[PDB]
Ligand binder design. Structure first.
Ligand SMILES: [Mg+2]
Ligand SMILES: [Mg+2]
Ligand SMILES: [Mg+2]
Ligand SMILES: [Mg+2]
Ligand SMILES: [Mg+2]
Ligand SMILES: [Mg+2]
Ligand SMILES: [Mg+2]
Ligand SMILES: [Mg+2]
Ligand SMILES: [Mg+2]
Ligand SMILES: [Mg+2]
Ligand SMILES: [Mg+2]
Ligand SMILES: [Mg+2]
Ligand SMILES: [Mg+2]
Ligand SMILES: [Mg+2]
Ligand SMILES: [Mg+2]
Ligand SMILES: [Mg+2]
Ligand SMILES: [Mg+2]
Ligand SMILES: [Mg+2]
Ligand SMILES: [Mg+2]
Ligand SMILES: [Mg+2]
Ligand SMILES: [Mg+2]
Ligand SMILES: [Mg+2]
Ligand SMILES: [Zn+2]
Lengths: 177, 65
RNA sequence: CCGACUUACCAACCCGAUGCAAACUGCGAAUACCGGAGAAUGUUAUCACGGGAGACACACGGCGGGUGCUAACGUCCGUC
RNA sequence: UCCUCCUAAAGAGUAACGGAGGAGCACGAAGGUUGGCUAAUCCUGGUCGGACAUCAGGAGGUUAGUGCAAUGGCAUAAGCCAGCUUGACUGCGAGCGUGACGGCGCGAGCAGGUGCGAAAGCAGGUCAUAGUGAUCCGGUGGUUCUGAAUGGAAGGGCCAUC
RNA sequence: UGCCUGGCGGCCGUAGCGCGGUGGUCCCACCUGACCCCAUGCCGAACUCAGAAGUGAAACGCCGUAGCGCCGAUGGUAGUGUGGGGUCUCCCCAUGCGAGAGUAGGGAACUGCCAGGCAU
RNA sequence: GGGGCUGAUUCUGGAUUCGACGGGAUUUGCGAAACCCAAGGUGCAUGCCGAGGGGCGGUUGGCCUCGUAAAAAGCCGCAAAAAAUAGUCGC
RNA sequence: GCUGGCAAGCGAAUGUAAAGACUGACUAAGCAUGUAGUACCGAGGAUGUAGGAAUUUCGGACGCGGGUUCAACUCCCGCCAGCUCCACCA
């Protein structure tokens, strides 16, 4: 939580005078960070689920929760209860620890990094953005991986509005356009 | 956090090709000794020039007019 | 020609009105039925048991109906 | 043969070769207890991923779901998960409902021994209603019995069951 | 004795939504961090166990708003139990019972226990 | 005017027609219609009445014009009046 | 540049026109419109969704009102079209 303890007071001071706040609790905050290894085409072989649950564990040290379907969409011929993907959610200390790694060490392994989209807000400004590979993270190398799968990161914040969330992220020095 | 089901998560050093060697916490194990990073990427700290009208290099204008 | 444009045409949700439903009810009567209290009246007319039967082919009208053609001195149900 | 809705006239019941659909099962968990939880649909953002999945937020509140056809119910949830277990026990049973009858169903509580819950308490199957067949004749195991002179046995009766 | 707060109930659609802005001396919430003893079929999102740095920002609660949802008269109408009738697939009269919807209007809840914090 | 069997290559609820031909979405270059602009050049136009157009006639009347209106030419019709069409098959 | 004008010449030693005010009718023309930006498109500023690439279903098991479906031509009704039975006694 190095970035947390360093930037909390600074972003509070900035945002209070920017948005005419009147309390410390009114500043937009950070709730959680979520990431799902959406492995869909894995019905034939379950080994893809294990590979996803190992790659996500390597990316963020935890045990990914193997998610189950709840609708059984016939467009892909699936039945509810079958494992589809795995999600990992981080709160507080782990959230901040993964945030600095996704902020600092995210560029070298990715190509054509000309910034990130500024309109990735779900109305309330929760910043769901996706990456197309896993070797982007320093933990995972390319020699030990067989398949290539991405991530569906989502940094869920307490910001009331999309512009407040954007100001939140800009103060956290995230590479927008 | 639960019991020993999750992998080890300790501080691991990381040194780039510039002046920033971080001590963030990661489960990679061996030290990174990585390459160009956010503080030195050409995205906002160098070589902002692109192919936006460079034009063919003219060598014909070296003999006469 | 892009079609200027509406060519007695059709056109998802959303709202504003207008109707229908035995298998629709956010509501909802009279009557029908049970129980509690009270006077008056009725040859106990009420219930239980025993002896003896008869009978299980009904029809019409009034009322609410299915079926039929809201046709039949047609047929099927409930009350008198 | 049995069940759900209407005709069925606001208690019960009520017919037709009337109008509409199902049942001749499944489950040692799909039961019991405790703890916890709340959708269908639609909108926005996001890597393959698409009218469709797996994610984050919002509109909406049962318009979802009940192992099944329909009706009546379910938020304390009867709807969905997790831990322990077999009350899906034995003998009774005040009372009541429904049938001409054989019958069928609800049921507080008692005795013995259990399961869950710290405890108060709950459990005599499954949200309820279809999932079913009298008697005779025989089969299987036990029997506090009967044993045609005696002692057994054969056989019969009794209990469970085919 | 009057202010508001907390807990348990009665009353469960005039008792509920939308809008305006207040509440902290008390109580509640947000929150700090967490090896315990507990917890996530991943994370203190929920249970919790150690507390008061800050805030009433979200909640919670309070005061007015007629934009809604609702409660809804009188009168009238439909229906009908009895008796008596017509032109009888339906209707009339003498009688009592008299709906539903829609008008006039009402309305921004009352109320019982303790448990404290307030002036008295 | 009424019953029974077929409308199944599967009866047993999950065929990529393997392919060409519609349609979707993902990863690439660009053309004010896949872009939003007057700034370098510093010329004589936006629009204002526009003339009837290849051999013939014509399009929102301006894609072609200029001096005070006329030839109109960048497209469309006449027009390209090679569309006469597998293999075998008589003098 | 002819040049008013002098310094360092002449043969062994001689090229040679330029964009900075626009104050104003704010050229004309059909009055207007721009006095260096308008009429003009272009990098003089730029930043965007037509079509070229690879993955999928859609056809074809039908003539069709539906319905159970996550879903089928393959499951249960009714609309037709084929095979077959009866349509008889007074
Ligand atoms: Mg009745
Ligand atoms: Mg008698
Ligand atoms: Mg008798
Ligand atoms: Mg009889
Ligand atoms: Mg008889
Ligand atoms: Mg008779
Ligand atoms: Mg009779
Ligand atoms: Mg009668
Ligand atoms: Mg009649
Ligand atoms: Mg008659
Ligand atoms: Mg007769
Ligand atoms: Mg009845
Ligand atoms: Mg419970
Ligand atoms: Mg115990
Ligand atoms: Mg049931
Ligand atoms: Mg017999
Ligand atoms: Mg003997
Ligand atoms: Mg024996
Ligand atoms: Mg507030
Ligand atoms: Mg009245
Ligand atoms: Mg009324
Ligand atoms: Mg009213
Ligand atoms: Zn670096």
């Amino acid at each position: 939580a190095k970035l947390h303890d360093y930037y909390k007071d600074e972003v509070v001071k900035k945002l209070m005078t920017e948005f005419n706040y009147n309390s410390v609790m009114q500043v937009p905050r950070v709730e959680k960070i979520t990431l799902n290894m959406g492995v869909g085409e894995a019905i034939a072989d379950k080994k893809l689920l294990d590979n996803a649950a190992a790659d996500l564990a390597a990316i963020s040290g935890q045990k990914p929760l193997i998610t189950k379907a709840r609708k059984s969409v016939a467009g892909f011929k699936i039945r509810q209860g079958y494992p589809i993907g795995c999600k990992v959610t981080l709160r507080g200390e782990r959230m901040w620890e993964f945030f600095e790694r996704l902020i600092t060490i995210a560029v070298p392994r990715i190509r054509d990094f000309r910034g990130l989209s500024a309109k990735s807000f779900d109305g309330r400004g929760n910043y769901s953005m996706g990456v197309r590979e896993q070797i982007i993270f320093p933990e995972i190398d390319y020699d030990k991986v067989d398949r290539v799968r991405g991530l569906d990161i989502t940094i869920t914040t307490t910001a009331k509005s999309d512009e407040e969330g954007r100001a939140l992220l800009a103060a956290f020095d995230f590479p927008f356009r | 956090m639960k019991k020993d089901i999750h992998p080890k998560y300790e501080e691991i050093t990381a040194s780039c090709s510039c002046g920033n060697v971080m001590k963030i916490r990661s489960t990679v194990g061996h030290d990174l000794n990585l390459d160009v990073c956010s503080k030195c990427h050409p995205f906002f700290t160098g070589k902002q020039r692109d192919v936006a009208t460079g034009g063919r290099v003219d060598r014909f204008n070296k003999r006469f007019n």
